[PDB]
Amino acid sequence: XXXXXXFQSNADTGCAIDISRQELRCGSGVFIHNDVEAWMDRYKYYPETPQGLAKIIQKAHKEGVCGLRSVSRLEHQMWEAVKDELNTLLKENGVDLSVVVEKQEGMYKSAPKRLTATNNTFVVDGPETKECPTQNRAWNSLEVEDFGFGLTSTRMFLKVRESNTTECDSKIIGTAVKNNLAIHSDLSYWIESRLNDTWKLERAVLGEVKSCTWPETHTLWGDGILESDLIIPVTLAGPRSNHNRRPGYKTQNQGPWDEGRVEIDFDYCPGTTVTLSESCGHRGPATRTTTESGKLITDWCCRSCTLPPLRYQTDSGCWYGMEIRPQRHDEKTLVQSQVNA
């Protein structure tokens, strides 16, 4: 599964039903789909030329770049799928260099080196090592040049970026608002806000947690921003937008951002309560509702949040927002986020 290559036509054209207006309507415009919560991946990354990429790497290798960290899971999946190919490319040209791709657990961190146009390894992702520290790795060096048709999925071809930026690739971003529901999204983030008495964040699904910055061009309601109010941190591709807020909550810099997939919404973790209490503990690291031993922590408080509570759902269970604390300071087997972003 990695085949190599080697009616306004700028717009979407089709039909949809608008459930709110209760109208079936055809024509042209902009259609944003939910691709984060989709069964398969409709999209796969590809290099414009594997040979080109191999050249990019060996060059960066000469200039002392020991490896790379992917921007996203999709990018990782490319490096994973194209490594054997890149390696036979180097091998057959007499280049003493092999690409090595390690499993990625947790958030995709940024790095400061950049691949440019044109030991003996190039290490993609993995744990932090003294041998190949992040500071000598490349990150966010590629972007989408063109899209390629496929039967099963659609191809995205990567070129080398012309400049140095921390911005997420805008080619794959879809932001939209209609019927007072607002969506900031790309291939791995789906962030939904809605008007109900007030405008506020309602739900978010993060396929992984990345470290690029959400571009202003693709951001709604981005005036008069106070970053410390932004639920999802801008250092974690949180859109710098007033939609990325919830009354009674500040930036979740210590949310469980290193668990892999994270779903944010506002409801109670199963079998728990949350109470307003001026005697509750101050905000701290996001905390799970099950201990290491597995037992359920039922009673929770908050000093000044609003209900329903900010809830995180991950592979290992349910967590609460930073402002929500265990009512009883007696449980010692806590599982808490050790992130600071």
Ligand X SMILES: *[C@@H]1O[C@H](CO)[C@@H](O[C@@H]2O[C@H](CO)[C@@H](O[C@@H]3O[C@H](CO[C@H]4O[C@H](CO)[C@@H](O)[C@H](O)[C@@H]4O)[C@@H](O)[C@H](O[C@H]4O[C@H](CO)[C@@H](O)[C@H](O)[C@@H]4O)[C@@H]3O)[C@H](O)[C@H]2NC(C)=O)[C@H](O)[C@H]1NC(C)=O
Ligand Y SMILES: *[C@@H]1O[C@H](CO)[C@@H](O[C@@H]2O[C@H](CO)[C@@H](O)[C@H](O)[C@H]2NC(C)=O)[C@H](O)[C@H]1NC(C)=O
Ligand Z SMILES: *[C@@H]1O[C@H](CO)[C@@H](O)[C@H](O)[C@H]1NC(C)=O
Sign of the torsion formed by the C-alpha atoms of 333, 334, 335 and 338 = negative
- Of the candidate residues 55, 59, 83, 114, the single one contacting ligand Z (CB under 6 A): 114
Q: Which of 236, 214, 306, 307 is CA-nearest to residue 268?
A: 307
Structure tokens at 228: 């410390």
Smallest gap from residue 247 Cβ to ligand Y (A): 12
Which own/partner pairs from 102-107 qualify as long-range (CB within 8 Å, at least 24 positions apart)? 102/126, 102/127, 104/70, 104/73, 104/76, 105/260, 106/209, 106/257, 106/258, 106/259, 106/260, 107/208, 107/209, 107/210, 107/211, 107/236, 107/257, 107/258, 107/339, 107/341
Q: Which of 231-245 are b and which e, b meaning 16 or more Cβ less than 10 Å from the residue's Cβ?
A: bbbbbbbbbbbbbbb
Question: In this structure, are residues 151 and 54 in contact, taking their beta carbons and an 8 Å threshold?
Answer: no
| Residue in 93, 136, 179, 316 binding its own copies, rule: CB under 8 A | 179
Answer for which of 109, 113, 243, 246 binds ligand Z (CB under 6 A) is 113
* One-letter identity of residue 131: E
What does the chain come to in residues?
341
Q: Which of 112, 148, 247, 270 is the binder for its own copies (CB under 8 A)?
A: 148
Say how far apart CA 189 and CA 250 lie, in whole Å: 20
Instruction: Output the smallest distance, CB 30 to ligand Z, in A.
Output: 31
Asked if residue 163 binds ligand Y (CB under 6 A), the reply is no
| Closer Cβ to ligand X, 82 or 269, answer by number | 269
Tell which one of 37, 63, 197, 315 touches ligand X (CB under 6 A): 197
- List the interface residues with its own copies, window 189-208 (CB under 8 A): 192, 194-195, 199, 202-203
* Binding site residues, ligand OXN, CB under 6 A: 15, 24, 26, 151
| Strand order across the beta sheet in which 43-47 lies | 43-47, 154-160, 142-148
Q: Which residue number is nearest to ligand OXN in terms of Cβ?
A: 26
Asked if residue 258 lies in contact with residue 302, where contact means CB atoms within 8 angstroms, the answer is no
End-to-end CA, the chain: 35
From the list 4, 29, 226, 273, which residue makes contact with its own copies (rule: CB under 8 A)?
29
Per CB under 6 A, the list member of 13, 152, 154, 164 interacting with ligand Y is 164
Q: Which of these segments, 44-52, 106-114, 150-158, 195-203, binds ligand Z (CB under 6 A)? A: 106-114
Site string for ligand Y, 105-134 (x = CB under 6 A): -----x-xxx----x-x-x-------xx--
Least spacing, CB of residue 115 vs its own copies, in Å: 22
Instruction: Give backbone dihedrals phi and psi of 26, rounded to 5 degrees, phi first.
Output: -110, 165
* CB neighbour list of residue 93: distance below 8 Å, 6 or more residues apart: none
User: Which of ligand Y, ligand OXN, ligand X, none does 112 bind, CB closer than 5 to 8 A by kind?
Assistant: ligand Y
Site for its own copies (CB under 8 A): which residue of 11, 117, 296, 334? 11
* Residue closer to ligand OXN (CB basis): 19 or 151: 151
Binding residues vs ligand Z (CB under 6 A): 112-114, 164
Interface with ligand Y (CB under 6 A): 100, 110, 112-114, 119, 121, 123, 131-132, 164, 196-197
User: Where does this chain bind ligand X (CB under 6 A)?
Assistant: 196-197
